[PDB]
Amino acid sequence: MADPRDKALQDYRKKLLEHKEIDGRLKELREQLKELTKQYEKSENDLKALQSVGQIVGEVLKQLTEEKFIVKATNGPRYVVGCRRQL
Amino acid sequence: EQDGIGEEVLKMSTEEIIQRTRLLDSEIKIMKSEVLRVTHELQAMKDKIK
């Protein structure tokens, strides 16, 4: 007759081994999630940054009125242009 | 692990029959549900990132 103490010890050891295996699986999944969260954050940032247009760089020569400025693009041409309100 | 060994030794029937088995079953069910949810979310997010 196997001792009940020995049976309980063997059952506890088997359950601990199964728990360790599932904990290893959970740790692998947690590492996967940790890496993929940052990877997806970077991918989302890249996608958001793709849809952004630049801005011409120029020099202000003179202000004609409140909402009218003379601006000289570095290319060479001079334009009469407006100004953003909260500026 | 010494505390666990002492418990499983001194209390062979008062803990293994009722306490240990139910705790292990509840834990295994909870972690299985968590693993399934995590796998589903990971698959969806991987499709999105692709």
Swiss-Prot record, chain B:
Post-translational modification summary for this protein: Sumoylated by UBE2I in response to MEKK1-mediated stimuli.
Disulfide bonds: none
Location(s) in or outside the cell: Cytoplasm; Nucleus
Top-rank taxon, per record: Eukaryota
Family note: Belongs to the AAA ATPase family.
Disease (UniProt): Deafness, cataract, impaired intellectual development, and polyneuropathy: An autosomal recessive disease characterized by early onset of deafness, cataract, severe developmental delay, and severely impaired intellectual development. Patients later develop polyneuropathy of the lower extremities, associated with depigmentation of the hair in that area.
Function per UniProt: Component of the 26S proteasome, a multiprotein complex involved in the ATP-dependent degradation of ubiquitinated proteins. This complex plays a key role in the maintenance of protein homeostasis by removing misfolded or damaged proteins, which could impair cellular functions, and by removing proteins whose functions are no longer required. Therefore, the proteasome participates in numerous cellular processes, including cell cycle progression, apoptosis, or DNA damage repair.
Subunit and partners: Component of the 19S proteasome regulatory particle complex. The 26S proteasome consists of a 20S core particle (CP) and two 19S regulatory subunits (RP). The regulatory particle is made of a lid composed of 9 subunits, a base containing 6 ATPases including PSMC3 and few additional components. Interacts with PAAF1.
The name this protein goes by in its record: 26S proteasome regulatory subunit 6A
Residues of the full protein shown: 25 to 74 of 439
